[PDB]
Symmetry: C2
Subunit: 151 residues, 2 copies
């Protein structure tokens, strides 16, 4: 329940998907979401670009969604992972993500927090590619993806 | 408080560091930790290797630490990020991380979950490099790193 056993060949990117739910000791719920940009195993986002997307979405997701724990790039680089304090709400996360991506696509200012003081690899960034990935997702159109379990 | 404003030029990798604390509506605490392998801006872990480390630590951290929400690679690729349900406990996370790294360094079996069904980029893995990064951290020696705030 904390991490659904997803069949990666059956999903349709881009999408938002509830990936698991963890209940805290006092009864609160931590919802985990799979924010998929690319189709699994059909290519990956460049390290620089996903790093920049991390910098931009960290802030833009919080402008549109409450209770965000963190937004992290997935090791597979086809999307972002995000934990949110609150009961599952795929529709609300989808709308927040869509709004955050519009902010990212239209981000023509310096990348926030890029320096040796605030960033662990300040030289590895790509705004242009980050913005274009946001645009591609919006062009294709997002949807809530159901979890197809493996056998 | 949910994300301390760290001065990246003052830390000493490798280390474990409480990076922030988020309190849930019912009063539980979600502790966030910075598991730093490399010194900020002195190099990065290859995408394949960090992806494999993600696969291995997801399981090995849970063998040694309760309440783990998720273990994710940082966009800067100098370490891993992890959220844990529970009050701050840097010492306990350090010991868990050390034990998990010994499991990783000694992992000579197939990488878990590597296939088109269970992984979003199954072709991008590097066990050898993953294991060597675990060994390097253990050789250098871990310590709990205090957060030096920026000005
Ligand atoms: Zn950064
Ligand atoms: Zn994977």
């Amino acid at each position: 329940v904390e991490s659904f056993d997803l069949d990666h060949t059956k999903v349709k990117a881009p999408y938002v998907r509830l990936a698991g739910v963890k209940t805290t000791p006092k009864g609160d719920q931590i919802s985990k979401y799979d924010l998929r940009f690319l189709q699994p195993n059909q290519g990956a986002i460049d390290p620089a670009a996903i790093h920049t997307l991390e910098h931009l979405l960290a802030g833009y997701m919080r402008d549109h969604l409450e209770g965000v724990v963190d937004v992290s790039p997935m090791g597979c680089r086809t999307g972002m992972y995000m934990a949110v304090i609150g009961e599952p709400d795929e529709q609300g996360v989808m709308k927040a993500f869509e709004a955050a991506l519009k902010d990212t696509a239209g981000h023509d200012q310096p990348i926030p927090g890029v320096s040796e003081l605030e960033c662990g690899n300040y030289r590895d960034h790509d705004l242009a590619a980050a913005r274009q990935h946001a645009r591609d997702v919006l062009d294709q159109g997002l949807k809530v993806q159901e979890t197809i379990l493996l056998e």
